[PDB]
């Protein structure tokens, strides 16, 4: 009853129509399976990183985590093969305003709920998996804009880039990191703004955050028509609290979100999606 | 060399709000820690090994169009399989509840047929190949957006007491099972499913006795392919009938692989704009 599943090995010649996108991410189609897939692909110890990530994704399978379809492991080529995500990332949805002038509230709330469901699952694994690199860029959107959490490069078992989602206690090297990033994401989702807009240098962000400053909360950033505004602001504020001991577990955060999500009729989620490009 | 994923064990007491759905009994529940709805398939020490077998198959056969297993509930007082909850029921209910669903748009029907084929294809391409052997509309589950999840691997086999059920999806040569049964069982079932999807009709509707069906089918009778069952306005009608007729051939050897079916379906699906799938789902809500 120690039931085990093995991650399939995919021969490079099976990845037909390799095309560059944005590690290096490429799209392909599996020759036998007949599905479009995504491939993430020099060195000798950078191999251990890729295998480690592929193992994490394979072990963390869940409804809101990016599904891994297999590993392409050869002398010639090394890659992680995952389901293709046609709608990109949450970053693109919130910030490409001419492509997406309207992102209805029900869908924004659904995304916020699913992100939390995914991280909660990771934290409940045995032993707990901490993501440690959550950002709008790493929340992928499937064909119907359901969430798939990706990029397990910095993830850790509990046994240089953008710093806007990083809790201050991390600038001078915790189970309370993900919730902090989640709070910033929530603010970003509800405002459609870039956290710390007017800041020209990332060291100014790091300094400000270390002194307890946070993305701005007022009528311009978070308009009064936001459903359940006061309740969302409390969640955001508790999530990015300076003292990490005062930040909530994902359990508590889900218990708070559940009644908020019940106020949206199911069909409103579908209608929010159809309205998109 | 191999990277392994272990199936979680879920304590019975973590399943809150247990409610009966089907009578293997199917129940709904919410997981106390994960905060998601789930489906639980359980009994009302040898009927135990059957469950563990199916759980293992679901766990090994993970793919985009196969029902995800979330864990196994294995205790002295309770044994069951925990899977993702499918809010839109089965393909069977979508096709035959005509009052609830007066219209089921062609693009959605075709996407369903396409996704079933992708699912079975994936199984057939495993090492060693997995054969479902119990496909039916009742076992094609639908998620929130009506995407396919293939379920019920109870009779499935790795190619290396009797429970009462319909025989309509069973190929005639399986009526008295041998050692050879066979990679060509699934395609026969798919062919009947395809006919049932395009017609929204119960196969062998006229025949009241299940045993009579078995006679007819061995004698070569198939579900009726005429105008009343498959109207002329059906998108790509000729090409679908050709797919069906070859799929349920009396001789297993003439029946096509799923790969072949895919190749045939890929151009058909490209004739439907993305928007039409979303419209079809909104229409069903
Ligand atoms: Ca209706």
Closest listed residue to residue A55, CA positions, set B264, B69, B172, B2 = B2
Residues ≥6 apart with Cβ < 8 Å to B175 = B167, B214, B218
For residue B3, the distance in angstroms to the closest alpha carbon of chain A comes to 6
DSSP H/E element including A140: strand A139-141
Mutate to test the interface with A, among B2, B5, B53, B68 (most CBs of A within 10 A): B5
A212: left (phi over 0), alpha (psi -120 to 50) or beta: left
Hey, is A225 helix, strand or coil?
A: coil
DSSP string computed for A30-43: ETTT--EEEEE---
Interface contact B125-A32, CB threshold 8 A: yes
**Residues B39/B33, Cβ–Cβ less than 8 Å:** no
Q: Would you please indicate which residues of A are annotated as catalytic (active-site) residues?
A: 133
Report the alpha-carbon distance of residue B245 to residue B194 in Å, rounded: 10
Which residues neighbour A111 within 8 Å (Cβ) at sequence distance 6 or greater?
A90, A139, A141, A145, A147, A189
The DSSP 8-state label assigned to residue A171 in this structure reads: S
Would the CA dihedral through B267, B268, B269, B273 be positive or negative?
positive
Q: Which residue has the tokens 């995407």?
A: B147
Instruction: For residue B134, give the nearest of B150, B148, B112, B149 by alpha carbon.
Output: B150
Count of CB contacts below 8 A, A vs B?
A: 97
Q: Which residues of B touch A48 (CB under 8 A)?
A: none
User: Residue A226: which residues within 8 A CB-CB, separation 6 or more?
Assistant: A105, A190, A232
Round to whole Å and give the CA distance between A224 and B217.
67
Nearest to B136 by CA among B124, B152, B147: B152
Q: Are A39 and A80 in contact (CB under 8 A)?
A: yes
Contacts of A83 in chain B (CB under 8 A): 64
> Cβ neighbours of residue B123 under 8 Å, at least 6 residues apart?
B61, B63, B66, B129, B130, B131, B132, B150, B186
DSSP class of residue A9 equals B
The token pair at A143 is 């064909």
Mark out the alpha helices in chain A (DSSP H runs): 46-59, 90-95, 105-123, 177-191, 202-210, 229-239, 250-261, 266-274
Q: Is A181 annotated as a binding residue?
A: no
SS3 A148: strand
Residue A101 in 3-state DSSP?
Answer: coil
Contact A240, A168 (CB under 8 A): no
Chain centroid to CA B144: how far? 17
Q: Do B56 and A6 touch (CB under 8 A)?
A: no
Resolution (A): 2.4
Structural domain boundaries in chain B: 1-285
Tokens of A243: 């003292």
Superfamily, domain B1-285: Transferase(Phosphotransferase) domain 1 (1.10.510.10)
Interface residue ranges in chain B relative to chain A, Cβ cutoff 8 Å: 2-7, 9, 33-36, 52, 55-56, 59-60, 62-64, 68, 70, 72, 74, 84, 118, 121-122, 125, 144-145, 259, 262, 266, 275, 278-279, 281-282, 285
Cα of A252 to nearest chain B Cα, Å: 11
Dihedral sign computed on CA atoms, order A87, A91, A94, A95? negative
Measured CA to CA, the distance from residue A132 to residue A178 in angstroms comes to 6
d(CA B124, CA B128): 8
Nearest CA in chain B to A271: B282
Q: Is A97 annotated as a binding residue?
A: no
Q: What is the DSSP letter of A51?
A: H
Maximum Cα–Cα distance across chain B: 57
Q: Which of A94, A107, A103, A87 is CA-nearest to residue A267?
A: A107
3-state secondary structure chain B: CCCEEECCECCHHHEEEEEEEECCEEEEEEECCCCCEEEEEECCCCHHHHHHHHHHHHHHCCCCCECCEEEEEEECCEEEEEEECCCCCEHHHHHHCCCCCCCCCHHHHHHHHHHHHHHHHHHHCCCCCEECCCCCHHHEEECCCCCEEECCCCCCEECCCCCCCCCCCCCHHHCCCCCCCCCCHHHHHHHHHHHHHHHCCCCCCCCCCHHHHHHHHHCCCCCCCCCCCCCCCCCCHHHHHHHHHHHCCCCHHHCCCHHHHHHHHHHHHCCCCHHHHHHHHHHHC
From 3.30.2010.10, 1.10.510.10, 2.60.40.790, 3.40.50.300, which CATH number describes the A1-277 domain? Answer: 1.10.510.10
- How are the residues of chain A apportioned to helix, strand and coil, as percentages rounded to the nearest 5? 40, 15, 45
Residues of chain B contacting residue A274, judged by C-beta atoms under 8 Å apart: 275, 278-279, 282
| Elucidation method | X-ray
Can you read off the two tokens belonging to residue B94? 């979508």
**Distance from C-alpha of A145 to C-alpha of A85, rounded to nearest angstrom:** 9
Rg (CA), chain A: 19
- Which tokens is B43 given? 């009994």
**CB contact at 8 A, B111 and B168:** no
User: Which residue in A has a C-alpha nearest to residue B121's C-alpha?
Assistant: A33
Distance from C-alpha of A107 to C-alpha of A105, rounded to nearest angstrom: 5
Would you tell me how many other CB atoms lie within 10 Å of the CB of residue B72?
23
């Amino acid at each position: 009853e120690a039931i085990c599943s093995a991650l399939p090995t995919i021969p490079y010649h099976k990845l037909a129509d390799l095309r560059y996108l944005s590690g290096t991410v490429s799209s392909a189609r599996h020759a036998d399976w007949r599905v479009q897939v995504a491939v993430k692909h020099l060195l000798d110890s950078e191999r251990k990183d890729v295998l480690r990530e592929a193992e994490i994704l394979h072990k963390a399978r869940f409804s809101y985590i990016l599904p891994i379809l297999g590993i392409c492991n050869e002398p010639e080529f090394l890659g992680i093969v995952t389901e293709y995500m046609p709608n990109g990332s949450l970053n693109e949805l919130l910030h490409r305003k001419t492509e997406y002038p309207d992102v209805a509230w029900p869908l924004r709330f659904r995304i916020l709920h699913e992100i939390a469901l995914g991280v909660n699952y990771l934290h409940n694994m045995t032993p707990p998996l901490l993501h440690h690199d959550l950002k709008t860029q790493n929340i992928l959107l499937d064909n119907e804009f359901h969430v798939k959490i990706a990029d397990f490069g910095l993830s850790k078992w509990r046994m240089g880039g953008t710093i806007i989602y990083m809790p201050p206690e991390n600038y001078e090297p915790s189970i309370k990191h993900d919730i902090y990033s989640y709070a910033v994401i929530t603010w970003e989702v509800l405002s459609r703004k870039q956290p710390f807009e007017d800041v020209t240098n990332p060291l100014q962000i790091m300094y400000s955050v270390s002194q307890g400053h946070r993305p701005v909360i007022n009528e311009e950033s978070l308009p009064y028509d936001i459903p359940h505004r006061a309740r969302m602001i409390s969640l955001i504020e508790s999530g990015w609290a300076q003292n990490p001991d005062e930040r909530p577990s994902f359990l508590k955060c889900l218990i708070e979100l559940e009644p908020v999500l019940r106020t949206f009729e199911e069909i409103t989620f579908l209608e929010a999606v159809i309205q998109l490009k």
